[PDB]
Amino acid sequence: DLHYLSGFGNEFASEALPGALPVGQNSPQKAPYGLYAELLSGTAFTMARSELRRTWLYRIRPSALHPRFERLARQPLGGPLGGINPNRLRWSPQPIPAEPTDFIEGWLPMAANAGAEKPAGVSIYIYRANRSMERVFFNADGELLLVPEQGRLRIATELGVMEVEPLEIAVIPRGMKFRVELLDGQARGYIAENHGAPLRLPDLGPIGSNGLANPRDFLTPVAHYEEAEGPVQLVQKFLGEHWACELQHSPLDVVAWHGSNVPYKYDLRRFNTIGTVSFDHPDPSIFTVLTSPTSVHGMANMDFVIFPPRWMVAENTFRPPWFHRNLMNEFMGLINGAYDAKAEGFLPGGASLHGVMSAHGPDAETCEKAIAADLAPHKIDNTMAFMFETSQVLRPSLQALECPQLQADYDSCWATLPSTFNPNRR
Template identity: 50%
Template sequence: MTGLTRLKEAIERHRENKDINIKYKTPLTMTEKSEAVPGALPIGQNSPQKAPHGLYTEKLSGTAFTAPRNENQQSWLYRILPSSSHQNFQPVPDSSSQSLQSPSPSFGKHFNAIPNQLRWDPFDFDKEVSWIHSLHLIAGAGDPQMKQGVGMYIYAAGASMPEKTAFYSGDGDFLIVPQHGTLDIRTEMGNILVRPMEICVIPRGIRYHVKLHNEEPVRGYILELYQGHFQLPELGPIGSNALANSRDFQIPKASFIEDFENTEWTLYSKFGGNLFQAKQHHTPFDVVGWHGNYYPYKYDLGRFNTMGSISFDHPDPSIFTVLTAPSHGHGHGTAVADFVIFPPRWLVAENTFRPPWYHRNTMSEFMGLICGAYDAKGAGKGGFQPAGASLHNTMSGHGPDMQTYEKASTMELAPAKVGEGSMAFMFESVLMVGVTEWGLKTCAKVQEEYNDHSWGPLKVHWKNPGTRGLSNGEAQKGVGDGKDHSSVHDTK
């Protein structure tokens, strides 16, 4: 799949968006506005004594009121009834069909923080459950109550959410990465259709309903961000254009339902890692107009403008970052979460080992595969497969498997296209990521022989230069005997 082909497919997906009432706008940087009925937005002020058309004014704040102007995120909603109009929330019983299958562990508990390299076989579809019940927390770090850390989920659903239900996470922003099937999402601020090769971000607190498009089962990945919000990475010496360009992000147009007489809706809230429900006698989707810079948005991965080396050596994978969430407490340029992709691209570096090098990283790396085969790992049964995943935690060594190394270290280095028909991604975090019991045991998808299959067969190619000129018998002395063969010259 060439870059031009990917762009043409992205353009075709854009043309299809005419059916879902969506528009291109810069994400989370400038104030936007949308109204489903002309005149729904007040002119010249946010909260008039009486809002237009008899609507209620409601402010939705994604940051503290006093956050710096360039970081402040908020939107004003003009709706038929305010979101506060509902009955008390009650915990959802574990036996309910709408319960969370793997609730978030409390701070510092129940996450299995282990240094082992982990890889999972493809996760199964579940045709019996809808969105909420399909959310499986597989790994994470921190605590949503402290607004610190991240959660990494697998979702797999075979049914739309029941009619007259809505869901929101009070714990953090959802970055949704579909692997199979299309999500038809109605949010308070409008509709978004999200397909594989696209991503969607639904910020903390925004209510939504997930319908399966054409009733096709869905499966994918979610990164929940407990602290801060996603933003575009700084480009530095790259300049003003590259990677994900702000013009290619999309936000919904205002769309509302009139349903507030003789009706009952159920609102589900993920709060502190647990699930609650409340009844209300009106639809949550009654926002007639809104303006601000706190809203859901989507991005087509086919529009990512990949950068790379055109001389020698393999650049850091940070050049593939789509979105980032800085972790100011861990130092400049460090992220509590990065969303990184590995799209089809040309490799032309000379005298260079082109796949990712072997490395140990202070960052934790959770990878998934949307389609195709990842160029650094073997595919097929027992390999890195679409709908599977891997986790290489803080300072856990990893890199290409034996077959990939042998091929890449001996191949002719002509210009080559890698990743055709493929899209891998990474959730990267400065935090030490733990694995839930569901992810480690219950799902029964962990590849127990991952380490042995990937790096156990690596061959020794070492040739001791100190044996040159010696007879064969003399050269063999000390080879592989485990002794220290350093010389006094090593200290100079």
């Protein structure tokens, strides 16, 4: 049923009725089908064209037709930041709550660059839901990157419907209205809420003009509108708060649209993974799928990086990640299988945080196997881990620090590292 349009960054055009898009202009005095033209400006008007995101919508009712928004009683993001804590942290998977919880009600704040009330940089959540949304929602605080881990989602957006399963990702532009339906009854996955410059493909450098995530594989849904008359709740997230009003129509009433500010999805199984074909262990920036820049050239707001099935051929090399201390902040999760660097304790749905200059690296067991291994071409398979790497430090929420799922002795995973130093034998 669902068709998609391909090509990251494209000026797309889609209409659900023939000729619904005005021809040769954006704002006819009398629009086709008696629709209303509406502009969704995702960026300042004066961005360089390469950075412009904006979409013209031709819709049954203007978005401006809504009564006063009011603050909902139920607020999942109102918990305070946790205390200062430099420790290396790891969480076991999050259980799905018993009480009714839809997609937006189910975000568990893990760690963020700032407090919810003054969004900046990145905010990280784990979502757990057991109901489809019976309302429509937009996020005024940022762009959303969704990384499903358990259960498929059907995401009905203003520009059309997309379905996403684990091993795929989805991105929803700031301000865009959507409704998240659960195809498998319940769902769990990771969210990076990006409050800065929109995610986009990394500069490829010497990799050139193809590879990593190829832009042909980024898919955007085709136009689709609803005509359901009767009360519909519109919720927006603003400064961390859920506010709502009630409409008497469906706000997913866009019959046609054209432009570049679009929801999209991507299948990580399609990543054109580049790595070493010789020796050593490349910097994990080499696995970058999407990135959000800052005004500081080369220092991202965040990089979305993956660790996929891949060939390991490095000769005479310590193949797992090197022991590491980073200016950046490293938040990892796991979609399936096991991650190469950690023998036990890092499960799908789990998470780790190694903040600025925290000493990390492969655990004792992994290290021991790696040095002893007899090296031949080896394909890592049946796994997908990822990282949200942020320039700003990630402060864990109080909820996360108080989480029963917060493992108590993560530090022990390094505790048995032996000295093997012998100044007498090079």
